Design a protein around this ligand. Structure first.
Ligand SMILES: [Mg+2]
Ligand SMILES: [Mg+2]
Ligand SMILES: [Mg+2]
Ligand SMILES: [Mg+2]
Ligand SMILES: [Mg+2]
Ligand SMILES: [Mg+2]
Ligand SMILES: [Mg+2]
Ligand SMILES: [Mg+2]
Ligand SMILES: [Mg+2]
Ligand SMILES: [Mg+2]
Ligand SMILES: [Mg+2]
Ligand SMILES: [Mg+2]
Ligand SMILES: [Mg+2]
Ligand SMILES: [Mg+2]
Ligand SMILES: [Mg+2]
Ligand SMILES: [Mg+2]
Ligand SMILES: [Mg+2]
Ligand SMILES: [Mg+2]
Ligand SMILES: [Mg+2]
Ligand SMILES: [Mg+2]
Ligand SMILES: [Mg+2]
Ligand SMILES: [Mg+2]
Ligand SMILES: [Mg+2]
Ligand SMILES: [Mg+2]
Ligand SMILES: [Mg+2]
Ligand SMILES: [Mg+2]
Ligand SMILES: [Mg+2]
Ligand SMILES: [Mg+2]
Ligand SMILES: [Mg+2]
Ligand SMILES: [Mg+2]
Ligand SMILES: [Mg+2]
Ligand SMILES: [Mg+2]
Ligand SMILES: [Mg+2]
Ligand SMILES: [Mg+2]
Ligand SMILES: [Mg+2]
Ligand SMILES: [Mg+2]
Ligand SMILES: [Mg+2]
Ligand SMILES: [Mg+2]
Ligand SMILES: [Mg+2]
Ligand SMILES: [Mg+2]
Ligand SMILES: [Mg+2]
Ligand SMILES: [Mg+2]
Ligand SMILES: [Mg+2]
Ligand SMILES: [Mg+2]
Ligand SMILES: [Mg+2]
Ligand SMILES: [Mg+2]
Ligand SMILES: [Mg+2]
Ligand SMILES: [Mg+2]
Ligand SMILES: [Mg+2]
Ligand SMILES: [Mg+2]
Lengths: 129, 122, 80, 154, 205
RNA sequence: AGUUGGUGGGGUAAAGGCCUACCAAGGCGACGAUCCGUAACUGGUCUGAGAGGAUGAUCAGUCACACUGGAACUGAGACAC
RNA sequence: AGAAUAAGCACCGGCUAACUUCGUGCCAGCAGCCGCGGUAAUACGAAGGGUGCAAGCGUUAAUCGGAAUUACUGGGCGUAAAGCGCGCGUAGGUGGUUCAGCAAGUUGGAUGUGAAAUCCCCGGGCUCAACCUGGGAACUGCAUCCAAAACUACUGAGCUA
RNA sequence: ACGAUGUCGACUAGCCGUUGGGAUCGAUCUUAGUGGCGCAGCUAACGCGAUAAGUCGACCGCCUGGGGAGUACGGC
């Protein structure tokens, strides 16, 4: 009953990429907005925009390049049932370094390589390829 | 199983029981032969195998197989038995070592005559 | 710099003593999930000023009785 | 590409009034050794003819895989039916650490250091299916750069 | 220990080079070295992968005359050593003392080289070494005894090995019956027909 | 039911229900108390890609015992191979 | 001085490297699993001939692996074993969104310990190795402090999906 | 005691019926149930397919070869 909304955001994005949609809307959240900013900067999504009037809506437009979608495998790691926390040395490199992992560190929400550049670990939110 | 369910009750391994309950973690054991006789095998096969009832040192009463073409076992002969299950005879789970105490091995065996306790003709 | 320990008062029916529950969350050695464990300690309340429900911080000293080797240094929160 | 490899030969039978009719199925993998590979199946009344039909099928529908200089790109996990497959790149010294259908597929394709394992059922046909469904789907660099420039992605 | 028996029945079984004689006449016109021995000899006998591993492992062991406890110890040491164990095994197995005193040209056969090395007739720096397993460090001047320099068996072995090839990494002075090893051989130096990877595949199972 | 806490005293080299007389009814427990079976513990050993699984032969640290059950004397130290 | 003086065991139908003949004829016998034998047995018992190890070779008993076959890494429940007959609810587990604080979890660092040996890396000695030995690495652990505030927890004040 | 399918929540092409209501101009839209097909996706296959057996979260129950056996003994 809406216990974990970040996985809900990821599931909406994956289900749209599977049904070949161009835009996706969802209820807005600060964590979701941070993750969307990181994903947009990394290049997995085209653009995102946040509405106003008390019930903000986060909207994301998707990319496909070829007939396939750009985000082929997005999944959750630290669900509210495990709460996985990792150190700098033991952070996960995904797909041999061609993917990214979103990590919430004490300096904000960034990617695994950016976290290593600052030598700081945190909580692994989700992995994207 | 959910992680919480496993925390409340962890996964448990089931122990493996021994196929040779007698001779408790022992390579082979001595006994005395109560009775020698012959038996019929299971359905696909047909023969007259030679099995001896043995009373061990501990007290277990077991059956054992006299492997070979001839034997010299009477009722009161001391024998030594080792693990190994005769697949054909129901209930037999041990083998009498040839030429150990009162078996003397089998005579005039040339090919692989170490499993049957025969000496080198040389 | 005394090594204190914070806890919640549970029962005080024995004179000049107080029972304190201290809650910790330990990580399961294999499954990686945190579980809340609790410890019951007995502390010396010289002037029995701690009623039930109060939240206090104790300190380790020499044994005062059998199974009583802690003394409360000061109450940090009261109860309703 | 031309390097044969006969993965399996099996005997099957169908029932008719009077008795049984026998046939032989051959599963084979064919490739060159630098990234082209395909697999084929052939059933015939005789073992040789089955092998040649398998080879002809294998030469058709032969695909291209982008390998990382005698090594895989990244650890990958694939599946087909009830069979699951895991592979990951290895160092230069290591050989092909795999078993059965996987070893045939990998040594024909061109890789040499694979360190692979398989879980679930071990049917050679389904294992070959899973191994291609894994190898075919790798991306290689400057193709994950389908988002932005390179050297800012690795 | 050591192997005693026919030295070409092995070649007939394996069907390959398998140097085991002096090489005076030839390799062929002694034993029709193209058929496996015994009554059942003409059959090619197509053999599975395990056959391949067993056959080449026996090939290498018989050419270098090493037993299997020693061979597996050699393989474990090679696996311990870094950098593509497959050729590390060959490099380390080549540095044996008996095979060096053979390949230096002092012996007609590996067995005769072992004969010489065991009976205390060869030096390393003047010190008596008679273990046919000594791993010769690069730089050592392997030589025969000043007493033994007049034996004619060494002379005949040397003149026979005078035409067998040049390895192009050792520096050998032939007048004084001495050898010298500079650096370990490369993979390309040895005969590039038998692969090393199939052995490490065998021992990885 | 000396069971939990307090007071006075005793006792030990030393804190302490360690012992005693009174005061109150407390204390522990499904986070497994009590009871039954089994077993010296650790560094470590064997396996395993790892996580784990089994285990405590040699060597080293700690503990306990000395035909069975108790008790004290001597001393710096013993309830004494 | 003298080649003098010192080779055995198992196996050969498939899994698993290695075949022919003779003798019995569902008998005698073999066997880890499929299984061989009733009158040409490469599976029984012997011969030759091979294959594998070797001062050893097999057999038995015991542990882990293969076994993703107790699945944290890493399994499942319509029909193969597996959703309580169905609600309500205690402890427990989990918690929509905003602002602010704190610093238990979380992260980085410093300090003390983690006995020696054993494990790992580079050397030294016994003709090498086994074995002995120097230096280093490691011992994921634990405790005490300093700094950060994204997420969880705790505190206060809100908002309406 | 069966949908042989635990409860709760979020997303994912469409077509044809029917039950209890709303709107807009017999038609269109929408809501809570009840049925038949069907694209993706899933499945060993049969088949499921917005009333998932699809993609995801929270919590609970249960399984570990067939017999002996849901039996024997003890407890309630
Ligand atoms: Mg057995
Ligand atoms: Mg299976
Ligand atoms: Mg030896
Ligand atoms: Mg009293
Ligand atoms: Mg007092
Ligand atoms: Mg008192
Ligand atoms: Mg005490
Ligand atoms: Mg208990
Ligand atoms: Mg014990
Ligand atoms: Mg005991
Ligand atoms: Mg123990
Ligand atoms: Mg004891
Ligand atoms: Mg190891
Ligand atoms: Mg494993
Ligand atoms: Mg002892
Ligand atoms: Mg000790
Ligand atoms: Mg004592
Ligand atoms: Mg005593
Ligand atoms: Mg006695
Ligand atoms: Mg006494
Ligand atoms: Mg005294
Ligand atoms: Mg004494
Ligand atoms: Mg074979
Ligand atoms: Mg046999
Ligand atoms: Mg015959
Ligand atoms: Mg035979
Ligand atoms: Mg396991
Ligand atoms: Mg097992
Ligand atoms: Mg799991
Ligand atoms: Mg299963
Ligand atoms: Mg049924
Ligand atoms: Mg139900
Ligand atoms: Mg219930
Ligand atoms: Mg309820
Ligand atoms: Mg509650
Ligand atoms: Mg929240
Ligand atoms: Mg809560
Ligand atoms: Mg820390
Ligand atoms: Mg140490
Ligand atoms: Mg701060
Ligand atoms: Mg049911
Ligand atoms: Mg359900
Ligand atoms: Mg439901
Ligand atoms: Mg449901
Ligand atoms: Mg639903
Ligand atoms: Mg349908
Ligand atoms: Mg199913
Ligand atoms: Mg059972
Ligand atoms: Mg009953
Ligand atoms: Mg009853």
């Amino acid at each position: 009953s809406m216990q974990d909304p970040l996985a809900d955001m990821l599931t909406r994005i994956r289900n749209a990429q599977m049904a070949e949609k161009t835009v996706v809307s969802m209820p807005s959240s600060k964590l979701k907005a941070a993750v969307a900013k990181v994903l947009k900067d990394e290049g997995y999504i085209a653009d995102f925009q946040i509405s106003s009037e008390v019930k903000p809506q986060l909207s994301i437009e998707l990319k496909y390049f070829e007939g396939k979608p750009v985000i082929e495998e997005v999944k959750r790691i630290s669900r509210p049932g495990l709460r996985q926390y990792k150190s700098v040395e033991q952070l996960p490199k995904v797909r041999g370094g061609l993917g990214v992992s979103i990590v919430s560190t004490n300096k904000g929400v960034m990617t695994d390589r950016a976290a290593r550049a600052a030598g700081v670990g945190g909580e692994v939110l989700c992995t994207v390829f | 199983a959910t992680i919480n369910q496993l925390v409340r009750k962890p996964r448990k391994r089931m122990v493996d029981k021994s196929d040779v309950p007698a001779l408790q973690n022992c390579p082979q054991r001595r006994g005395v032969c109560t009775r020698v006789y012959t038996t019929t095998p299971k359905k696909p096969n047909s023969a007259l195998r030679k099995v001896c009832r043995v009373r061990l040192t501990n007290g277990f009463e077991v059956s054992s197989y006299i492997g070979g073409e001839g034997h010299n076992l009477q009722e009161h002969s001391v024998v030594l038995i080792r693990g190994g299950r005769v697949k054909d005879l129901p209930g037999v789970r041990y083998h009498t070592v040839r030429g150990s105490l009162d078996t003397s091995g089998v005579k005039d065996r040339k090919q692989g005559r170490s499993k049957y306790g025969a000496k080198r003709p040389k | 710099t005394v090594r204190t320990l914070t806890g919640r008062v549970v029962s005080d029916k024995m004179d000049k003593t107080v029972t304190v529950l201290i809650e910790r969350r330990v990580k399961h050695p294999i499954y990686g999930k945190y579980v809340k464990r609790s410890t019951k300690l007995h502390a010396h309340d010289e002037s029995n000023q701690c009623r039930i429900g109060d939240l206090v911080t104790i300190r380790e000293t020499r044994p005062l009785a059998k199974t009583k080797a802690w003394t409360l240094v000061d109450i940090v929160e009261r109860a309703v | 590409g031309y390097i044969e490899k006969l993965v399996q030969v099996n005997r099957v039978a169908k029932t008719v009034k009077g008795g049984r009719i026998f046939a032989f199925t051959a599963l084979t993998v064919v490739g060159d050794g630098k990234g082209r590979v395909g697999f084929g199946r052939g059933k015939a009344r005789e073992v040789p003819a089955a092998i040649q039909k398998a080879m002809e099928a294998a030469r058709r529908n032969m695909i291209q895989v982008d390998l990382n200089g005698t090594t895989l790109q990244y650890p990958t996990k694939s599946a087909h039916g009830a069979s699951k497959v895991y592979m990951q790149p290895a160092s230069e010294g290591t050989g092909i650490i795999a078993g059965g259908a996987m070893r045939a597929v990998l040594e024909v394709a061109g890789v040499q250091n694979v360190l692979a394992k398989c879980y679930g059922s071990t049917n050679p046909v389904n294992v070959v299916y899973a191994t291609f469904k894994g190898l075919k789907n790798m991306q290689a660099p400057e193709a994950v750069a389908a988002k932005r420039g390179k050297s800012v992605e690795e | 220990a050591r192997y005693i028996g026919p030295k070409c029945k092995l070649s007939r079984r394996e069907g390959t080079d398998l140097f085991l004689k002096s090489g005076a006449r030839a390799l062929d016109s002694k034993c029709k070295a193209e058929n496996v021995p015994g009554q059942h000899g003409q059959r090619r006998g197509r053999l599975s992968d395990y056959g391949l591993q067993l056959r080449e492992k026996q090939k290498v062991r018989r050419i270098y005359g090493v037993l299997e406890r020693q061979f597996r110890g050699y393989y474990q040491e090679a696996s311990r050593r870094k950098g593509s164990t497959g050729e590390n095994l060959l490099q380390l197995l080549e540095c044996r003392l008996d095979n060096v005193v053979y390949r230096m040209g002092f012996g007609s056969t590996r067995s005769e080289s072992r004969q010489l090395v065991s009976h205390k007739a060869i030096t390393v720096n003047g010190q008596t070494v008679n273990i046919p397993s000594y791993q010769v460090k690069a730089g050592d001047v392997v030589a025969v005894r000043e007493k033994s320099k007049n034996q004619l068996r060494i002379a005949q072995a040397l003149e026979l090995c005078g035409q067998r090839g040049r390895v192009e990494w050792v520096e050998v002075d032939l007048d004084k019956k001495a050898g010298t090893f500079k650096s370990a051989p490369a993979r390309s130096d040895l005969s590039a027909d038998i692969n090393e990877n199939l052995i490490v595949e065998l021992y990885s199972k």
